[PDB]
């Protein structure tokens with residue numbers, strides 16, 4: 001309980017505004033997170049003081065920019081407890097990292113009869129690349145079933161993963177159900193069958209500590225915009241032995257060693273996978289966001305989100321005619337639906353009260369079909385959210401219920 | 415002569431500092447450009463006021479973020495005079511856009527016997543993707559020769575481009591020679607042979623007006639970091655008819671329409687080519703940079719750079735023992751070498767005087783071999799550079815010459 005939430009909110013300028021005459025209640029951090037002054041001012045200092053191209057050491061500003069970029073790389077490495085900076089690749093985001101794994105590893109290690117195994121709860125970023133890969137290779141795509149509470153059983157994993165499985169791609173935390181998947185056990189299961197494991201950690205990395213050596217994941221993808229960092233930057237971690245054998249996904253400057261007229265050689269890791277001028281300011285700002293989160297403490301943030309999630313689940317259960325999807329033990333988010341009220345109208349009415357939630361399919365259409373719903377609403381939490389905001393949310397949901405019941409038969413009166 | 419260079423420099427905070435006790439003289443804008451307060455404060459306002467995920471219209475901040483992102487897209491469209499926003503794709507940069515063309519178009523439209531034609535002056539971003547593409551397809555890569563002054567003759571283009579040529583990939587402006595290539599005539603030549611034309615416009619877009627309908631280019635790539643915009647964002651323009659027939663290079667959320675267990679359909683253009691959460695802040699800042707440059711006027715910037723280039727060429731010709739590469743008519747940059755002084759030491763001594771130039775191969779190794787040199791130095795200009803800075807550069811080069819001649823035989827005295 002070391003965390004002071006008021007002192008934390010004081011660092012986020014975007015929280016201190018009104019929307020439609022009501023104080024802003026931002027409950028959409030699973031879509032994207034807000035940034036503290038540390039990150040924004042890091043970007044400001046970069047553009048104001050030492051912006052330059054990196055990886056030359058020719059003049060002073062170039063050296064400072066290179067130092068910032070590679071220091072951010074080292075910050076990421078220690079943040080996820082990677083063994084080496086050669087295993088940390090800066091990308092455009094989680095989606096780009098997963099696509100890089102699918103292109104450079106899957107399309108080069110899959111033959112007919114091979115299996116890529118995913119789950120029904122995966123976001124589209126962890127579905128479409130594997131579809132395209134197994135189509136290009138003639139392999140087979142399989143799905144791990146889910147329990148009725150939206151979790152995955154280890155025996156179902158042992159059943160789905162076979163000796164023909166080469167890749168197991170799975171989410172660390174589901175942005176819809178809030179489920180925390182048994183990533184370590186699934187990694188051991190995949191390794192027992194001769195498969196590698198790809199972990200979509202876009203929703204886990206911002207909210208809980210990531211120990212890549214303890215999870216024993218082979219690949220791990222994360223996005224900066226979800227963890228108080230700048231947009232347009234993410235990280236691909238891969239085991240160094242795997243990344244050494246993968247060919248680059250992109251080609252150009254900065255990633256080459258020798259360039260002939262028709263053939264070229266690549267740089268060593270990690271620069272082999274970073275073509276062109278890198279995302280310098282964004283990566284430095286992601287390093288700043290890592291410093292911010294680590295100064296607060298990821299275990300603290302996770303405990304705060306557990307408090308928020310338990311409180312929100314209890315208060316949602318106090319509402320009649322509201323369905324919540326997912327297990328009891330969950331990350332800091334609640335996906336739900338109002339009886340006889342479309343989630344889009346729920347979100348509209350909530351925004352009229354200054355409350356920002358999500359309505360739609362959440363980039364998980366097969367999961368929506370598994371849930372037997374067309375769309376849902378979702379309120380997601382982060383380190384700057386409070387129980388009073390959850391009270392505002394549940395009161396607004398009760399008032400939305402009452403208003404849509406009033407409008408209902410007031411023109412049945414007609 | 416409407417441009418006031420002092421008023422322009424006042425908007426760039428990074429220019430007003432000292433390096434090694436000397437006022438900063440940034441002459442490395444071909445590597446990356448510096449940013450005015452408008453762009454940095456655009457990023458600040460985004461992160462402070464309306465950061466949210468885009469393309470939902472669910473709550474107020476999300477709507478404002480979506481409006482900013484798509485308005486930046488429209489700004490780009492009008493900036494390069496594209497017909498439609500469906501032809502404007504936000505990417506990581508010029509390199510990523512060229513790789514997307516090579517993956518989605520080249521690898522799907524090349525068979526044995528087909529030709530991809532490039533030039534000897536191309537940067538690595540416009541070389542390696544075509545190498546990999548013609549290798550994957552079994553096609554043939556050809557090179558347009560260069561004149562002795564570093565320019566390209568149209569007859570050499572008509573000779574190299576044949577009826578078997580499917581793609582002609584060429585730079586608009588060379589970041590080494592300063593050559594402005596005849597892009598319109600080469601586009602007509604390529605179309606006469608049944609080929610499309612890909613234009614690397616990373617070095618042209620920041621410094622001269624781009625009329626995509628007048629150039630009749632089929633693809634056009636540009637980078638934001640070179641044109642006063644944020645790092646990590648660029649643009650791929652493609653003719654809408656070509657982009658409609660190309661499959662996506664990346665797969666994930668935001669670019670899908672329907673998602674089944676094994677098959678999926680894509681969004682309409684341009685979102686078909688934008689997977690995952692986009693580079694929201696970076697794209698909005700690129701739009702701000704476009705507003706800034708257009709308020710100044712691209713023709714004005716180009717005239718200023720022509721003045722700077724003519725002045726620099728004349729003052730370089732006043733120095734003995736200095737070789738300049740490229741034609742007389744050129745963009746705002748000078749690539750050179752000192753006699754008996756390695757360009758790395760030139761750049762070091764210049765940085766000791768606060769002067770930031772480039773030393774190395776400039777991501778153009780085949781051009782360096784064509785120039786019969788291992789490395790060169792380069793001073794590149796932009797809208798915030800002055801003739802006094804060029805005077806400082808030439809005086810520092812003369813002093814470097816004198817110092818390295820003094821050190822030479824002062825230990826021959828030994």
Ligand SMILES: Cc1ncc(COP(=O)(O)O)c(CN[C@@H]2CONC2=O)c1O
Nearest residue numbers: 276277445507508509537589616617637
């Ligand atoms: C003509 C040209 N094409 C492509 C690029 C690379 O585009 P991105 O890095 O934005 O993807 C550059 C910039 N390359 C500079 C030139 O000098 N050193 C550089 O890194 C360039 O000048």
Ligand SMILES: Cc1ncc(COP(=O)(O)O)c(CN[C@@H]2CONC2=O)c1O
Nearest residue numbers: 031093094095123175202203223690691
């Ligand atoms: C579990 C998960 N995987 C992948 C992604 C996408 O990663 P990038 O967009 O950074 O590449 C998200 C964020 N997707 C959010 C979830 O809700 N709506 C979104 O757009 C996610 O929550």
